[PDB]
DNA sequence: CGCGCG
DNA sequence: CGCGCG
DNA sequence: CGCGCG
DNA sequence: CGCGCG
C-alpha cells in the first residue's frame, strides 16, 4: 500500500529519527510489514537508515 | 484470532510436518503472524516443533 | 560496584543518550545489573532518563 | 554454565516447586540469569513450569 | 518488554 | 512485575 | 535468517 | 533480535 508507505513517512516527518518498533506500535501494523516498506522506501531514496553494530537501525526522511 | 489458529492447525492436519514458510504462503498471512500463533499453540500443547541446528523448525499437530 | 557505576557513566560520557541495551552489550554485564545501577545513579542525580510511552528509556549524564 | 544449571536443578531436587525468587536468593545469582537457565532447561525437558494468571511461574523437575 | 523490585 | 528477550 | 519478541 | 527475505 501507498497508504502504509504514506503513513510511515508521515510518522517520520513528525517524529524524526525512529526505530521500526516506534513506528509499528503507533501505526498498529506488523513490524515485518513496516520493515518491508522501510527497506523499499530506502531503495527509492525516500528514507534512510543509520546503523551501529547490532543496534536497532534508525530511520529518517531523506533531506 | 481463533480463526487464524484454526486455519494453521487445519493446514497442519492436511499436510503434516510443515515450515512456517509452507503455511503463510498458502494462508496468505504474514510469516510473523503465523509464527506468533505457532509458538502460542506450542505453549498450549496443540502443535510441536522439532529443530536441528539452524534449520527451519518443522511444525506438526500433537498426537 | 563503584567500578560498574564508573563504567556505565563513562559509557554515557562517550556516547551520550543511550538505552540500557546499548550499555550492557558493550560492558558485557547483565541488563538487570546495568538497570539497577542506572536507577541508583538517577536517584543520586548523576544520570537522568527521559521516557515516552512504552519506549526504551534513554539515559544520559546530568549536566 | 553447566554449573549454574546443575545448581538450579539441585535446588529444585531438594526443594520441589519453587519460584525464581526462591532460587536466585539461595544461589546468589541474578534473577535474570536464573530465569534464562530455567527457560533453557524447560526447552530441554529437564524442568517445567506451571502458570496461573499473572502469578509467579512455579518451577520443578520433570519426572 | 516499559522491569530497576531487594 | 508475568520478563526468559540475545 | 533460526526470529515468536509484545 | 540486527531480519527486510518474496
Amino acid at each position: 500500500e501507498n497508504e502504509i508507505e504514506m503513513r510511515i513517512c508521515d510518522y517520520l516527518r513528525r517524529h524524526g529519527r525512529s526505530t521500526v518498533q516506534d513506528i509499528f506500535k503507533e501505526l498498529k501494523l506488523e513490524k515485518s510489514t513496516v520493515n518491508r516498506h522501510l527497506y523499499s522506501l530506502q531503495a527509492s531514496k525516500q528514507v534512510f537508515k543509520t546503523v551501529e553494530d547490532n543496534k536497532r537501525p534508525v530511520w529518517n526522511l531523506v533531506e
Side-chain angles (χ1 to χ4, degrees), chain A residues 5-6 9 12 18 24 26-28 30 39 41 47-49 52-54 56-58 60:
Chain A
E5 277 175 19
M6 168 178 312
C9 285
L12 295 174
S18 306
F24 89 79
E26 169 123 346
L27 300 187
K28 306 177 216 188
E30 293 276 341
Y39 280 89
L41 289 157
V47 306
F48 65 104
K49 85 182 175 304
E52 164 178 5
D53 305 280
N54 277 346
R56 313 202 141 156
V58 166
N60 204 355

Side-chain angles (χ1 to χ4, degrees), chain A residues 20-31 34:
Chain A
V20 61
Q21 285 81 8
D22 289 330
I23 299 163
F24 89 79
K25 300 177 189 180
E26 169 123 346
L27 300 187
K28 306 177 216 188
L29 300 163
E30 293 276 341
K31 179 177 78 82
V34 175

